[PDB]
Amino acid sequence: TPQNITDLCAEYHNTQIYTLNDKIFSYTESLAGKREMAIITFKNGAIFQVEVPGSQHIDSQKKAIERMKDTLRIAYLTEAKVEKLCVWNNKTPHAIAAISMAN
Amino acid sequence: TPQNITDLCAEYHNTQIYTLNDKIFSYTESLAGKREMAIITFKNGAIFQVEVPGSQHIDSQKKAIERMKDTLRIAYLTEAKVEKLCVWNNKTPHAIAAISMAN
Amino acid sequence: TPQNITDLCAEYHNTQIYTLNDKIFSYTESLAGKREMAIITFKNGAIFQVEVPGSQHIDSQKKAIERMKDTLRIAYLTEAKVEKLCVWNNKTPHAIAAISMAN
Amino acid sequence: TPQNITDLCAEYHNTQIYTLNDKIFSYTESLAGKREMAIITFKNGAIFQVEVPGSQHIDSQKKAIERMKDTLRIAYLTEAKVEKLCVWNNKTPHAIAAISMAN
Amino acid sequence: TPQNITDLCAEYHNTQIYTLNDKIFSYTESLAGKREMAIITFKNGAIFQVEVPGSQHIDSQKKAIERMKDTLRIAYLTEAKVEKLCVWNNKTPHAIAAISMAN
Ligand SMILES: CC(=O)N[C@@H]1[C@@H](O[C@@H]2O[C@@H](C)[C@@H](O)[C@@H](O)[C@@H]2O)[C@H](O[C@@H]2O[C@H](CO)[C@H](O)[C@H](O)[C@H]2O[C@@H]2O[C@@H](C)[C@@H](O)[C@@H](O)[C@@H]2O)[C@@H](CO)O[C@@H]1O
Ligand SMILES: CC(=O)N[C@@H]1[C@@H](O[C@@H]2O[C@@H](C)[C@@H](O)[C@@H](O)[C@@H]2O)[C@H](O[C@@H]2O[C@H](CO)[C@H](O)[C@H](O)[C@H]2O[C@@H]2O[C@@H](C)[C@@H](O)[C@@H](O)[C@@H]2O)[C@@H](CO)O[C@@H]1O
Ligand SMILES: CC(=O)N[C@@H]1[C@@H](O[C@@H]2O[C@@H](C)[C@@H](O)[C@@H](O)[C@@H]2O)[C@H](O[C@@H]2O[C@H](CO)[C@H](O)[C@H](O)[C@H]2O[C@@H]2O[C@@H](C)[C@@H](O)[C@@H](O)[C@@H]2O)[C@@H](CO)O[C@@H]1O
Ligand SMILES: CC(=O)N[C@@H]1[C@@H](O[C@@H]2O[C@@H](C)[C@@H](O)[C@@H](O)[C@@H]2O)[C@H](O[C@@H]2O[C@H](CO)[C@H](O)[C@H](O)[C@H]2O[C@@H]2O[C@@H](C)[C@@H](O)[C@@H](O)[C@@H]2O)[C@@H](CO)O[C@@H]1O
Ligand SMILES: CC(=O)N[C@@H]1[C@@H](O[C@@H]2O[C@@H](C)[C@@H](O)[C@@H](O)[C@@H]2O)[C@H](O[C@@H]2O[C@H](CO)[C@H](O)[C@H](O)[C@H]2O[C@@H]2O[C@@H](C)[C@@H](O)[C@@H](O)[C@@H]2O)[C@@H](CO)O[C@H]1O
Ligand SMILES: [Ca+2]
Ligand SMILES: [Ca+2]
Ligand SMILES: [Ca+2]
Ligand SMILES: [Ca+2]
Ligand SMILES: [Ca+2]
Ligand SMILES: [Ca+2]
Ligand SMILES: [Ca+2]
Ligand SMILES: [Ca+2]
Ligand SMILES: [Ca+2]
Ligand SMILES: [Ca+2]
């Protein structure tokens, strides 16, 4: 079991760490059908998504996707500094797999 | 996959973007039978709804509908600026499909 | 679709609008068996309940009842001004069907 | 139906009202097998639990028990004054049935 | 029934009390398949996890695991002081069983 986000992200061939060290600039969410997703941005121009759930996810992933959307919303509204994101960089915009917050 | 609210909105028929750049003026919610909805207003007189779940929603949007009302409530209570709403403009009040918050 | 709490409330028998224009004075909640409810009071003496879920309710109201107790708790804790309540006046205390909040 | 926590408590055997008029001094929660509970304390030395779900609880209480833990946590973190607790006094620590907040 | 976290922790083997008396330095959360977990750190170098849910957790702990991650996120965002953690010291990093928070 990894002990930080960088070592977690290393376990997935399909991933990359972004180091932001900045609050979320905008939060977007959608209830439109097949686009039940969130999108966040940073002042540096980075855009990331929390993906729509699909067959790419086992049951535990579904719950954690909902959690991540909860986390990004409150992080936005509290101006919490996001340290790093672990993202899938094959998806466009890059999909969030993990988040670290420190400040 | 859309990278922003406007791209997302532009995916659907009978939608438009409202650019509010303002906090929500009022928040209403009902648990009355057949009217399990929310209504928000802005100072400019704009009124929007999160629709009652009916036939026009696939069962997967049900969770996103619940999340949207949670988002609107906490946005209202934190006085968070709403940047844009993507709405079905053929409903009265116009029906919320997506939201972005910035600044 | 109604555009406001007053018009929504008018769609049901045995309801009326109370116009409080005030913060909730007290918030009570119970997990006791057959009393799984919330009660709020206002400085003016008004007492209102969120009713225990039951036969009088329909399936789509279940989630909305829970949402309403969520809303009253966080309204209480943020000292949010309650504009209006739509309530059933054939219950004691009168039973909340909808709420609006405005600055 | 009761109109306040004192009348509510009187409906049950083995209960009594604790009048605290004070914030929660500490909040503990456990995910440990068979001790999935919350414990709260007050500065005066009072200690109270939200019981582990069990055969003393009917199905309608399950969501209420989870709600009460949500309530205690947020009350703790907001330093919200707890007026009264309705508790079962045939358990150690006494087991919360109902909470009233006012300040 | 335990009245505090220390007496609670003693009911289990391979569990130990860590007294932090400090706020959470960093909060990490992941939705990656098979790593649906939270990691928290403290300034003193201590690292703790909420475990990915698994065959080692009984049914009554599944809800409590999701709650704990909720509790840790909100604790991090409010800079709440963690008094003690009860953890399984046979996991790497050590896995949270319970938390106490006090002023
Ligand atoms: C090459 C790489 O490692 N990643 C790129 C990413 O660039 C990275 O992130 C940006 C913000 C900056 O820190 C770069 O130095 C860094 O390599 C690209 O990001 C785009 O950057 C431009 C710069 O102004 C715009 O801001 C653009 O909107 C950014 O793309 C968005 O954000 C990304 C994280 C992706 O999710 C992308 O799909 C978004 O449109 C992108 C460009 O495709 O490609 C890698 O992510
Ligand atoms: C309380 C009231 O009567 N408000 C109207 C407002 O209509 C409300 O809000 C709109 C968005 C819609 O959801 C209505 O069903 C609801 O009553 C009017 O806004 C216009 O409404 C029409 C037809 O719905 C179009 O939506 C039009 O785009 C709206 O005007 C735009 O939004 C306004 C708030 C202004 O920013 C205006 O400049 C925009 O063009 C307004 C018309 O001013 O009248 C009341 O506020
Ligand atoms: C009227 C009377 O004699 N009450 C006691 C009560 O103590 C009183 O109330 C408590 C909260 C505290 O302020 C006491 O100082 C006060 O005298 C007993 O509560 C325990 O009291 C001792 C101190 O005497 C400790 O403070 C202890 O933590 C208290 O018990 C805990 O909290 C209680 C509310 C119960 O949930 C109990 O199970 C916990 O262990 C109680 C309990 O024996 O007995 C009378 O009510
Ligand atoms: C990032 C890093 O290298 N941290 C170590 C820290 O270990 C981490 O945190 C502990 C709680 C545990 O979850 C580890 O699995 C995790 O990597 C070290 O902490 C000690 O770790 C061992 C187990 O490896 C025991 O848990 C031991 O009790 C821990 O020491 C206590 O906590 C420390 C932070 C100090 O307060 C120490 O005085 C305590 O005894 C520490 C020390 O080895 O070093 C890094 O911080
Ligand atoms: C216009 C009128 O006569 N209305 C009464 C209610 O009395 C009015 O509203 C109260 C909230 C007070 O502001 C009162 O001064 C005002 O005239 C009456 O409510 C009760 O009033 C008594 C005091 O006389 C207490 O305040 C009591 O708590 C009130 O009742 C509770 O709150 C209500 C809104 C309902 O939910 C009741 O079920 C509660 O018990 C009501 C009920 O007697 O009757 C109207 O006709
Ligand atoms: Ca700011
Ligand atoms: Ca801070
Ligand atoms: Ca203001
Ligand atoms: Ca701000
Ligand atoms: Ca005040
Ligand atoms: Ca305000
Ligand atoms: Ca204080
Ligand atoms: Ca206050
Ligand atoms: Ca600080
Ligand atoms: Ca404090």
Numbering used by the authors:
A (entry chain A), B (entry chain E), C (entry chain D), D (entry chain C), E (entry chain B): 1 to 103
Kindly provide excerpts from the paper associated with this entry.
In response to environmental stimuli, the bacterium produces and secretes its main virulence factor, the cholera toxin (CT). CT is an AB5 protein toxin, which consists of one toxic A-subunit (CTA) and five identical B-subunits arranged in a doughnut-shaped ring (CTB). The primary receptor of the cholera toxin is the GM1 ganglioside, which is expressed in distinct membrane microdomains of small-intestinal epithelial cells. There are two major biotypes of V. cholerae, classical and El Tor, which produce cholera toxins with a slight sequence variation (cCT and ET CT). cCT and ET CT differ in only two residues of the B-subunit, His18/Tyr18 and Thr47/Ile47 (classical/El Tor).
Moreover, no previous toxin structure has been reported in complex with the blood group H determinant, which is characteristic of blood group O. The crystal structures of the cCTB and ET CTB complexes were determined to a resolution of 1.1 Å and 1.5 Å, respectively. Both proteins crystallized using the same conditions, but in different space groups (P212121 and P21). Well-defined electron density is present in all ten binding sites of the two pentamers, although the ligand orientations differ. While the electron density of the cCTB structure primarily supports orientation 2, most ET CTB binding sites exhibit the ligand in orientation 1. Since H-tetra-BGA is an almost symmetrical molecule, the fucosyl residues are indistinguishable. As for the complexes with A-penta-BGA, the fucose near residue 47 is most tightly anchored to the toxin, while the other fucose is loosely bound, by indirect water-mediated interactions. In general, the two structures are very similar, except that the N-acetyl group changes place in the two different orientations; the axial 4-OH group of Gal is mimicked by the α-anomer of GlcNAc. In orientation 1, the N-acetyl group takes the position of the GalNAc residue characterizing A-penta-BGA. For one, only the H-determinant, but not the A-determinant, can bind to the toxin in two alternative orientations, likely contributing to its increased affinity.
